[PDB]
């Protein structure tokens, strides 16, 4: 019933920053709002209950305020252990509900990806399927776009991609994209191209190969 709307969805910040995340309830919830921190593979952990009370063990850099429909969580000085997703939640009326989360990630200078393209192996082609792979290595920020082109035709709906978690050493992301075609379709075309768009690149980078070798 009561919707919790968090903003921003993603927050980029540096160690030492003051960080503020906002949560808005669709109905009055008094001060029955809690904040939770979650890291990948782990259960949520309680930071703040009752809108403003610090749970036991929680460092003093965490605080919250608000009443009625508007709430904030503040981290006064961001520490390396604080990059995580944060959720607000109301416990004013059942069903208890939660915000969609705010991911706090590490800000750093923009970095363009190194791009690499990999043709399908001969071993795979024997099985009737071709996987062409495009790697975008060590870029920042996370937003990136891959466009597959086959003999200049933009491909859509026949690719899948995934992205690594932010790197703990250099704070970059990497992305792998796979275009999957039948062997019959693969052998009908010559030029396979991965075109990468990123805010670090002044213009798109394309890596390509021609089926057959060189």
């Amino acid at each position: 019933d009561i919707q919790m709307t968090q903003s921003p969805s993603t927050l980029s910040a540096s160690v030492g920053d003051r960080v503020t995340i906002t949560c808005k309830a669709s109905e009055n919830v008094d001060t029955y709002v809690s904040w939770y921190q979650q890291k990948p593979g782990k259960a949520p952990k309680l930071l703040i209950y009752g809108a403003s009370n610090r749970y036991t063990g929680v460092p003093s850099r965490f605080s919250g305020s608000g009443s009625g429909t508007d709430f904030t969580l503040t981290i006064s000085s961001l520490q390396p252990d604080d990059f995580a997703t944060y959720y607000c939640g109301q416990s004013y009326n059942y069903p208890f509900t939660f915000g969609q989360g705010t991911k706090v990630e590490v800000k750093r200078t923009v970095a363009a990806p190194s791009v690499f393209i990999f043709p399908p192996s001969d071993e795979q082609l024997k099985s009737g399927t071709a996987s062409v792979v495009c790697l975008l290595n060590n870029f920042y920020p996370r937003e990136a776009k891959v466009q597959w082109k086959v003999d200049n035709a933009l491909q859509s709906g026949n690719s899948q991609e995934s992205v690594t978690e932010q790197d703990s050493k250099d704070s970059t992301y990497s992305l792998s994209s796979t275009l999957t075609l039948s062997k019959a379709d693969y052998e009908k075309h010559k030029v396979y191209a991965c075109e990468v768009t990123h805010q670090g690149l002044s213009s798109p980078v394309t890596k390509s190969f021609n089926r057959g070798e060189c």
Binding site: Y36, S91, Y94, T97, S114, S121, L135, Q160, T178
Partner: protein, 220 residues
């Protein structure tokens, strides 16, 4: 101190049912409610319901009224949640959480329930061979494509763990076939390509499939 210990991951076919457990330690079990929460992959938290271990009084999120059944055995300090008529959309981590005051301090570690009609299958491992010429300098990329396996997970190492710097192993994608595909790559000095061997070590424990794939130049 307080521990909530949940049962292990479940792999279930659609139409089936599953019963997940949550054993409580370190406090008086009948003095707090147990709440259940769903977190679908890549998504947020959804409250399912709660039960009072003292007497079994249960309340449900009405969205789960024909899906979830909460019970308790106070004699063994354990709460259970049964999900019926499983479908794809029931795939999630489910948490239990102790509830006294209007907040959730103590959470179980979560139980992953995956719902799929797929059957166990070990991966094919194909090379992502370092290119003949290209880049913007003296670093090359290579890798392995770990294709068509079920279920998760798969592990990948390089050179038996000797090679970690430059390694990126990506989240698997779920294909329309019901099977997963994953890539692992590494960037290395292009001058190393002729002299240093690179082997990806893949282990898919559910099918008992291990492969060592040596990857080297040979595209054109």
């Amino acid at each position: 101190q307080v521990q909530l210990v949940q049962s292990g991951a479940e792999l279930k076919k659609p139409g089936s049912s599953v019963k997940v457990s949550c054993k409580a330690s370190g406090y008086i079990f009948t003095s707090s409610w147990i709440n259940w929460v769903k977190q679908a992959p890549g998504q947020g938290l959804e409250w399912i319901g709660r039960i009072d271990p003292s007497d079994g009084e249960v309340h449900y999120n009405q969205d789960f009224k024909d899906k979830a059944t909460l019970t308790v055995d106070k004699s063994t300090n354990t709460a259970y949640m049964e999900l019926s008529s499983l479908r794809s959309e029931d795939t999630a981590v489910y948490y239990c959480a102790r509830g006294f005051l209007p907040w959730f301090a103590d959470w179980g570690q979560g139980t992953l329930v995956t719902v799929s009609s797929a059957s166990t299958k070990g991966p094919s491992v194909f090379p992502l061979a370092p290119s003949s010429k290209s880049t913007s300098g003296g670093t090359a990329a290579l890798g392995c494509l770990v294709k068509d396996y079920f279920p998760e997970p798969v592990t990948v190492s390089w050179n038996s763990g000797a090679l970690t710097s430059g390694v990126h192993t990506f989240p698997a994608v779920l294909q329309s076939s019901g099977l997963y595909s994953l890539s692992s790559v590494v960037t290395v000095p292009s001058s190393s390509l002729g002299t240093q061997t690179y082997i990806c070590n893949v282990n898919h424990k559910p099918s008992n499939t291990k492969v060592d794939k040596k990857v080297e130049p040979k595209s054109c």
